[PDB]
């Protein structure tokens, strides 16, 4: 129904969505300002690593700093095939996408990195309170020339 | 408008199927394949090989739940959160999962992971289920050495 509360919810959902879209389409130099889409105490980072522990960057300044490292390590990164999922929580979105670009990590040769990604975005007062990325670390190993372990699955149909 | 009332109906029905899927345990896992369409696809989208292990069709889903009940004999999903989307036929689930892993040729272990699941529906049944996790936790549960990525310059 058309109550003012459901209008507020819809309003917020619409503003939050535009922030998700902006985050996902940010490229090149503007990547250095993306930290401004987060709350002061916002957290962003990679939730699927080889260690099994999240790489979580806490706070806007730290996100700012890490965006510099990221521009060096992924100089031409683009997100593609982007699909945004709104949820029953107007402050929570998921995104399913791909990504591609050069990977330049010290200690390895320069490679082409492609992966499939899920992102979680949680909001608070119109800014990102928590962003989390989920991907398959095995595709990153390949991109870096690191040997991928294989599971035998004997007697799988 | 009854378009939105059909949609809301579709969403609430599909959501109960997602709940049932997620809370199925023990022997009832032999019958979960019945929640799928006949042509339905289920499986693991994050593998070491980079290709999905997709199990196509209701009958095959059934047979692969037999294998799965030997490999993961006491598996349970926990800390379940269901996300509805703007599409009444598309849901996401964030959860944990754990239990014994018992694969041929590897030492028995205890597997635990963090999981995302995508469920897409058709006529109130599951047309496509996809699981996404971190394969490195599965390696670890199997005694398989996990390489370490060096991230130099990484700040704090
Ligand atoms: O793209 C950015 O500006 C960026 C900023 C921060 Br801060 C952390 C990582 C970033 N990019 C990586 C590229 C490879 C896939 N994961 C995300
Ligand atoms: O739990 C089931 O009944 C099941 C049925 C099918 Br057919 C395939 C895999 C199954 N379970 C595993 C548990 C370990 C984490 N990924 C999914």
Coordinates of C-alpha atoms in Angstrom, one line a residue, chain B:
Chain B
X1 CA -3.6 -4.9 -9.2
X2 CA -3.5 -8.8 -9.4
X3 CA -0.2 -8.8 -11.3
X4 CA 1.5 -7.7 -8.0
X5 CA -0.8 -10.1 -6.0
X6 CA 0.3 -13.0 -8.3
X7 CA 4.0 -11.9 -7.8
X8 CA 3.7 -11.5 -4.1
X9 CA 2.0 -15.0 -4.1
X10 CA 4.9 -16.4 -6.2
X11 CA 7.5 -14.9 -3.9
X12 CA 6.0 -16.3 -0.7
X13 CA 5.6 -19.8 -2.2
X14 CA 9.1 -19.8 -3.6
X15 CA 10.4 -18.6 -0.3
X16 CA 9.0 -21.6 1.5
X17 CA 10.7 -23.9 -1.1
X18 CA 14.0 -22.1 -0.3
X19 CA 13.4 -22.6 3.5
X20 CA 12.6 -26.3 3.0
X21 CA 15.7 -26.8 0.8
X22 CA 17.9 -25.2 3.4
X23 CA 16.5 -27.1 6.4
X24 CA 16.6 -30.6 4.8
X25 CA 18.7 -33.0 6.7
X26 CA 19.5 -36.7 7.0
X27 CA 17.4 -39.1 5.0
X28 CA 15.1 -36.4 3.7
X29 CA 18.1 -35.3 1.5
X30 CA 17.3 -38.3 -0.7
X31 CA 14.0 -36.5 -1.7
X32 CA 15.1 -32.9 -2.1
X33 CA 15.5 -33.4 -5.8
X34 CA 11.7 -33.3 -5.9
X35 CA 11.9 -29.5 -5.3
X36 CA 13.4 -29.0 -8.8
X37 CA 11.8 -28.8 -12.1
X38 CA 12.3 -31.9 -14.3
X39 CA 14.9 -30.1 -16.4
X40 CA 16.3 -28.5 -13.2
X41 CA 20.0 -27.8 -12.7
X42 CA 21.8 -27.8 -9.3
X43 CA 25.4 -27.8 -8.4
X44 CA 28.8 -26.2 -7.4
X45 CA 29.8 -23.1 -9.4
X46 CA 33.1 -22.4 -7.6
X47 CA 35.5 -25.4 -8.3
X48 CA 39.3 -25.9 -8.5
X49 CA 38.9 -26.5 -12.2
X50 CA 37.1 -23.2 -12.8
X51 CA 34.1 -24.9 -14.5
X52 CA 30.8 -25.7 -12.6
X53 CA 30.0 -29.2 -11.5
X54 CA 26.4 -28.8 -12.8
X55 CA 24.0 -31.8 -12.3
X56 CA 21.2 -31.6 -14.9
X57 CA 17.8 -33.0 -14.4
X58 CA 15.6 -34.2 -11.6
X59 CA 16.6 -37.8 -11.9
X60 CA 20.3 -37.1 -11.8
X61 CA 19.9 -34.7 -8.9
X62 CA 18.3 -37.8 -7.1
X63 CA 21.2 -40.1 -7.9
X64 CA 23.8 -37.5 -6.9
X65 CA 22.0 -37.0 -3.5
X66 CA 22.8 -40.7 -2.9
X67 CA 26.6 -40.1 -3.4
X68 CA 26.3 -36.9 -1.4
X69 CA 24.9 -38.8 1.6
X70 CA 28.0 -41.1 1.7
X71 CA 30.5 -38.1 1.1
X72 CA 28.9 -35.6 3.5
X73 CA 27.0 -38.0 5.9
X74 CA 25.9 -35.4 8.6
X75 CA 26.0 -32.1 6.7
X76 CA 23.9 -29.2 8.1
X77 CA 23.4 -25.6 6.9
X78 CA 23.4 -23.0 9.7
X79 CA 23.2 -19.2 10.2
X80 CA 20.8 -19.1 7.2
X81 CA 19.7 -15.8 5.8
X82 CA 17.3 -15.6 2.9
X83 CA 17.2 -12.7 0.5
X84 CA 14.3 -12.0 -1.7
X85 CA 14.9 -9.9 -4.7
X86 CA 13.0 -7.7 -7.1
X87 CA 12.5 -10.9 -9.2
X88 CA 9.9 -13.1 -7.4
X89 CA 11.5 -16.1 -9.0
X90 CA 15.2 -15.3 -7.9
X91 CA 16.5 -15.7 -4.3
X92 CA 19.9 -15.6 -2.7
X93 CA 20.9 -17.3 0.5
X94 CA 24.0 -16.5 2.7
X95 CA 24.8 -19.3 5.2
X96 CA 27.5 -21.5 6.9
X97 CA 27.7 -25.2 6.3
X98 CA 29.6 -28.0 8.1
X99 CA 30.0 -31.7 8.5
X100 CA 32.3 -34.7 7.9
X101 CA 33.8 -35.0 4.5
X102 CA 34.5 -38.5 3.5
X103 CA 35.9 -38.6 -0.2
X104 CA 37.6 -41.6 -1.8
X105 CA 41.4 -41.4 -1.5
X106 CA 41.5 -38.6 1.1
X107 CA 41.6 -38.7 4.8
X108 CA 38.3 -38.2 6.5
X109 CA 38.0 -34.6 7.7
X110 CA 35.7 -31.9 9.0
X111 CA 34.6 -29.5 6.3
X112 CA 33.3 -26.1 7.1
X113 CA 32.7 -23.2 4.8
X114 CA 30.9 -20.0 4.1
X115 CA 28.4 -20.3 1.2
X116 CA 26.2 -18.2 -1.1
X117 CA 23.4 -19.9 -3.0
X118 CA 21.4 -18.6 -6.0
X119 CA 17.9 -20.1 -6.5
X120 CA 16.0 -19.4 -9.6
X121 CA 12.4 -20.7 -9.9
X122 CA 10.0 -21.8 -12.6
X123 CA 6.3 -22.7 -11.8
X124 CA 7.1 -22.9 -8.2
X125 CA 10.0 -25.4 -8.5
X126 CA 13.7 -24.9 -8.6
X127 CA 15.0 -24.5 -12.3
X128 CA 18.6 -23.5 -11.2
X129 CA 20.4 -23.8 -7.9
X130 CA 24.1 -22.6 -7.8
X131 CA 26.4 -22.9 -4.8
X132 CA 29.4 -20.5 -4.4
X133 CA 32.1 -21.0 -1.8
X134 CA 35.8 -20.8 -1.1
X135 CA 37.4 -24.0 -2.5
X136 CA 40.5 -23.4 -0.3
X137 CA 38.5 -24.4 2.8
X138 CA 37.6 -27.6 1.1
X139 CA 41.2 -28.3 0.2
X140 CA 42.1 -27.7 3.7
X141 CA 39.5 -30.2 5.0
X142 CA 40.9 -32.8 2.7
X143 CA 44.6 -32.4 3.8
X144 CA 45.4 -30.8 0.4
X145 CA 48.1 -28.1 0.6
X146 CA 46.8 -24.6 -0.1
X147 CA 49.1 -22.2 -1.8
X148 CA 49.7 -18.7 -0.3
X149 CA 49.3 -15.5 -2.3
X150 CA 52.0 -12.9 -1.4
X151 CA 50.3 -9.4 -1.3
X152 CA 53.3 -7.0 -0.9
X153 CA 52.6 -3.2 -0.5
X154 CA 49.2 -4.3 1.1
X155 CA 48.6 -1.4 3.5
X156 CA 47.0 -1.1 7.0

